[PDB]
Design a protein around this ligand. Structure first.
Ligand code: A1BFE
Ligand code: A1BFE
Lengths: 306, 306
């Protein structure tokens, strides 16, 4: 029993973190085989943050303008290139701790673990979601760029995020590991700001299923809803539309609990209209939307507490 | 900016997890140097869970009744002993990944990271607190026993918890790494149940300081309180008494924010009496008590967003 915001074990990623310095700027890089991946803004200077021309900045650099440190050991850079908003620094040493890995570009609503790092040294691990507005509600300070987000399947680390920017509302923007930003954001100092966000409906439903698995039914009701009628309510509460694909994805949780998806939708509809009336669900007084269906199956018992 | 439930990087602990089997029971062990530590209830059988005599059960076992598996490799047990509620299995191989470590017995209110494991394989990491009633609100299933809780300081892992039991309310009980239970609990099937719990006042105050550091002051007020008068209110709301030692521990956060501790106590008093009135603090609609003062300093900027 229990239900926590649960991150993946971070060891396989810890062994990949290094420090990258260019000029007076230091941040983190990800060392896989003989390449170190890092944010290209490591090459910027303070007077040229408004609209850096990265091609023009990078052509002025040599391999030896980049310092890479793995623990106490200097790795010599033997090549460099820019791919979108990341730099790939070829180094003279292949990382002996390189895990089996993939690069993935995730969809909004998916979750991942973040290994926050500073000066190439891991600091902490937490779970986040890609919000519908393509920001993440991370926890990051100066020097955290190049920290990565990931999921682990069997022994394979799927890297999905590299940290680049903090927006005016204190939320975060970054890229996939090929250097493409999530959302409309970019690596320049402009007026960019998070668009209006929405609540991830399919995730809220998954978490209500988690609560049932763990033995709590107080919020259920005798009603059902059509998908169309549910979505009319979702829209009023700034919830993402629920699609038939979401309904299909909730199939296994529905089967394990005996609660049809549209019946759980009727429960959620009532919770939105009535509030929780001072009660909690899985220790929260808010409807939680940063657990996917997969996250629930991963953490919960396969046997419902009936 | 941001503030998350942040666990320590788990890699140093991952490298210590093994599987221990005795009879038909399998659980996790912690392999440090040439010893594997695990819950002694690995030697129990289903018909003798109500009041096992562990001394009598263990004398009937040989070294070769214990199977220890590290990944795909069998470690041969060459000695065994019982210390309180843990078994120490001496093995023929010292763990080459043993980190610098200590065993610590923590005080109630302190937090730690849990590496949940099954069959010797790490599954996930989350943060918990030792509750005032010496339970932990963990997330654990069958096979999770022997999973450990820890903090990391510099390169040194301080192990503070090993998982043993789930109580009827779905919360958890376990031991220090010397096998002494936290709280009145034990490794037998009885009517033991969590005592009444309280909210960890010093931690709530620390988290209010975190909210100020991160730029939010909405909940402050112009009042102050004496410690005695605050504690009269704390008691009414089932909060732990605040001591002068707690006030001293909050010193650094008070200095960084310019908010005297007793003034933050007056803010908390008002929050308890008035509620949050539909607002949130650091994304929570409840007053959070599983961040210590140290946790706040560890995660937050040293510069307040004034
Ligand atoms: C990475 N090390 C750092 C992470 C930030 C620092 C505070 N919290 C974080 O998450 N990233 C930056 O400081 C970036 C780097 C950058 C590249 C090109 C141009 C300008 C910058 C400055 N950075 C910002 O995140 C700034 N934000 C923005 O400019 C914008 F809001 F995204 F538009 C700022 C946080 C104001 C320094
Ligand atoms: C460890 N692998 C397992 C972890 C449990 C299983 C469900 N969630 C958990 O956290 N621990 C047990 O199953 C223990 C072992 C044990 C030792 C001696 C005597 C009886 C047991 C059975 N266990 C329990 O946790 C049971 N709880 C209790 O007996 C009590 F509430 F603590 F009193 C029970 C969860 C009912 C199986």
């Amino acid at each position: 029993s229990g239900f926590r915001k649960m991150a993946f074990p971070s060891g396989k990623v810890e062994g990949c973190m290094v420090q990258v310095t260019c000029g007076t700027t230091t941040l983190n890089g990800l060392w896989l085989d003989d390449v170190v991946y890092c944010p290209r803004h490591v090459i910027c200077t303070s007077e040229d943050m408004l609209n850096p021309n990265y091609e023009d900045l990078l052509i002025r650099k040599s391999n030896h303008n980049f310092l890479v440190q793995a623990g106490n050991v200097q790795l010599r850079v033997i090549g460099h290139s820019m791919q979108n908003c990341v730099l790939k620094l070829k180094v003279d040493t292949a990382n002996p701790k390189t895990p089996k890995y993939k690069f993935v570009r995730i969809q909004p609503g998916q979750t991942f673990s973040v290994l926050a790092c500073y000066n190439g040294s891991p600091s902490g691990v937490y779970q986040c979601a890609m919000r519908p507005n393509f920001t993440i509600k991370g926890s990051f300070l100066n020097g955290s760029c190049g920290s990565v987000g990931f999921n682990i399947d069997y022994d394979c680390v799927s890297f999905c995020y590299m940290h680049h920017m903090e927006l005016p509302t204190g939320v975060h923007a970054g890229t996939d590991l090929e250097g493409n930003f999530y959302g409309p954001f970019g690596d320049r100092q402009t007026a960019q700001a998070a668009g209006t966000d929405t609540t991830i409906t399919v995730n809220v439903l998954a978490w209500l299923y988690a609560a049932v698995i763990n033995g709590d039914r107080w919020f259920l009701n005798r009603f059902t809803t059509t998908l169309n009628d549910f979505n009319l309510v979702a829209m009023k509460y700034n919830y993402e539309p629920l699609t038939q694909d979401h309904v299909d994805i909730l199939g296994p949780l529905s089967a394990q609990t005996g609660i049809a998806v549209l019946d759980m939708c009727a429960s959620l509809k009532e919770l939105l209209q009535n509030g929780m009336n001072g009660r909690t669900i899985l220790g929260s007084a808010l409807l939680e939307d940063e657990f996917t269906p997969f996250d629930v199956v991963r953490q919960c018992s396969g046997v419902t507490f009936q």
